[PDB]
């Protein structure tokens with residue numbers, strides 16, 4: 001009925017396990033597209049698994065690092081780590097590559113891409129609120145924490161590459177921002193302003209509208225390419 | 226009148242905002258001299274701003290990292306971050322480059338250089354005292370913390386370069402120490418010995434005399450080159 | 451008399467200072483074998499000393515980093531740092547290179563190598579127990595912490611090389627595990643399972659048997675090469 005009542009239910013959907021699985025699937029799919037990733041999974045399977053954990057949990061690793069917490073604190077969530085490990089195994093080692101074939105099917109892939117953006121926006125907002133809890137007026141800390149929560153492994157791409165034996169120092173995601181990195185920066189500014197009370201909008205409405213923006217952009221970008 | 230009475234007033238001058246501004250101005254001037262820095266400020270303005278934040282607050286980032294605190298804890302000091310951002314903007318984007326012209330004027334630049342050394346020595350001593358508060362007998366932790374507080378961005382120069390898209394691994398400030406890095410190492414040893422009670426001198430007198438040493442050296446080095 | 455009574459005394463031998471000294475000696479010997487290490491000790495003695503501190507305490511640096519503690523927390527143990535510094539000085543600067551000659555004598559070197567493995571296994575188990583204390587069910591955190599405690603400087607070899615002015619990004623100890631790195635991974639899994647209560651064996655018996663495995667392997671590998 002009411003618009004705000006729909007936004008409250010949208011902003012409170014349980015991300016675990018379905019929306020988190022979509023996040024893991026899309027992120028590990030990107031890993032498999034990277035040069036040498038399939039070869040690495042055969043010769044260095046542990047390093048391949050660690051690369052996938054970076055793609056799945058890099059948001060929490062970077063946020064915890066920025067806030068001076070254990071960078072692997074999120075790995076105490078055993079069910080999430082196991083679910084992400086199952087996604088890595090199925091994408092790289094499923095007989096007949098069947099899991100890859102099913103999730104790469106474009107109608108299914110676009111749904112996973114949309115569900116991942118639901119998770120990203122929730123992570124941005126949680127980063128801002130978590131930083132605010134520790135620093136009531138730490139505007140720059142709120143923005144940094146929300147930014148790495150949304151960008152994820154992209155901001156540590158130079159060292160994700162290093163783990164794979166690759167070194168390309170001529171570029172990085174700060175010097176040249178991809179769209180998700182730049183959109184996460186815009187997002188963390190909006191949620192920080194909403195935390196300041198400067199932006200006259202409820203947190204649920206901002207989550208709903210910014211998620212729709214991300215869904216439309218990413219789905220369009222994915223379908224086009 | 227008394228020498229110790231003058232040292233107490235010298236060692237307690239409010240560094241914010243005037244002495245901190247001089248620190249920011251000199252540090253961002255060095256950034257602008259680095260290869261590709263002006264080009265970077267045009268094409269990648271956010272990364273340019275982040276580079277300037279490293280030059281202005283790298284001392285606190287490194288000390289917080291060494292002590293297991295949030296590496297961006299100092300960015301909760303909104304007024305300092307805003308003042309440093311204003312210095313970055315004026316140095317790189319002032320119409321007619323006027324701010325750069327005024328602060329690069331040698332009589333004015335030597336004053337800024339001298340005021341920066343006041344801030345550096347205070348930061349070294351604060352690092353030693355802060356580490357001591359957490360480790361009453363942690364001599365090596367006191368020396369490490371005082372050292373990075375004084376050296377600043379120099380000790381993370383390899384990764385300041387990486388942010389700019391530069392990689393020169395054949396050298397670093399530990400393998401080949403510049404004068405400020407080496408002088409900060411001598412300084413943190415002196416303040417640690419003063420904390421041990423081994424060195425028979427008041428903390429205010431050591432601040433006054435070591436600051437004068439730094440002022441004379443840096444001013445002379447700056448004027449000469 | 452009883453087997454478990456012998457294991458309790460074996461698993462509780464005081465590692466400081468004799469077993470720790472053997473750890474430092476073997477680790478600094480490996481440092482001296484690295485390319486340019488003797489030259490570095492002459493031209494950059496401070497950086498050489500820091501490299502040796504990484505080889506002696508890298509286990510604690512990495513574990514503290516993973517758990518969000520001060521990475522130099524272990525350097526508050528002044529006696530250990532001083533003992534490690536004495537080993538570095540004697541190995542690189544002893545007149546007539548006499549200390550190197552005595553500890554490189556194969557019968558003596560094999561004893562030091564065996565005593566180092568006693569220290570490594572104790573460090574693995576302590577890492578698992580320390581992580582468990584903070585995360586009662588953090589299986590993945592227990593395994594990560596035990597792993598870096600056992601592997602030591604090997605897992606940060608790329609940045610130990612960087613400190614020396616070397617950059618070889620085409621390989622790392624995760625992508626290509628050496629035997630001690632792989633054995634420490636097996637060890638931390640066993641001690642984690644023993645913490646889970648899944649593995650029906652006492653902690654003292656596991657320490658005794660896994661140490662013997664490491665002693666036999668490393669001594670054999672050292673003697674052979």
Ligand SMILES: [Ca+2]
Nearest residue numbers: 068293518519
């Ligand atoms: Ca911490």
Ligand SMILES: [Cl-]
Nearest residue numbers: 034035161166
């Ligand atoms: Cl790549």
Ligand SMILES: [Cl-]
Nearest residue numbers: 044045046047
């Ligand atoms: Cl492997």
Ligand SMILES: [Cl-]
Nearest residue numbers: 122123126127
């Ligand atoms: Cl979250």
Ligand SMILES: [Cl-]
Nearest residue numbers: 063126127130
């Ligand atoms: Cl968060």
Ligand SMILES: [Cl-]
Nearest residue numbers: 134135136137
């Ligand atoms: Cl407050």
Ligand SMILES: [Cl-]
Nearest residue numbers: 259260386391
């Ligand atoms: Cl440069």
Ligand SMILES: [Cl-]
Nearest residue numbers: 269270271272
């Ligand atoms: Cl930009």
Ligand SMILES: [Cl-]
Nearest residue numbers: 347348351352
């Ligand atoms: Cl300070």
Ligand SMILES: [Cl-]
Nearest residue numbers: 288351352355
């Ligand atoms: Cl400090």
Ligand SMILES: [Cl-]
Nearest residue numbers: 359360361362
């Ligand atoms: Cl105490």
Ligand SMILES: [Cl-]
Nearest residue numbers: 484485611616
């Ligand atoms: Cl090497």
Ligand SMILES: [Cl-]
Nearest residue numbers: 494495496497
């Ligand atoms: Cl030196």
Ligand SMILES: [Cl-]
Nearest residue numbers: 572573576577
């Ligand atoms: Cl230990």
Ligand SMILES: [Cl-]
Nearest residue numbers: 513576577580
């Ligand atoms: Cl530990």
Ligand SMILES: [Cl-]
Nearest residue numbers: 584585586587
């Ligand atoms: Cl619990």
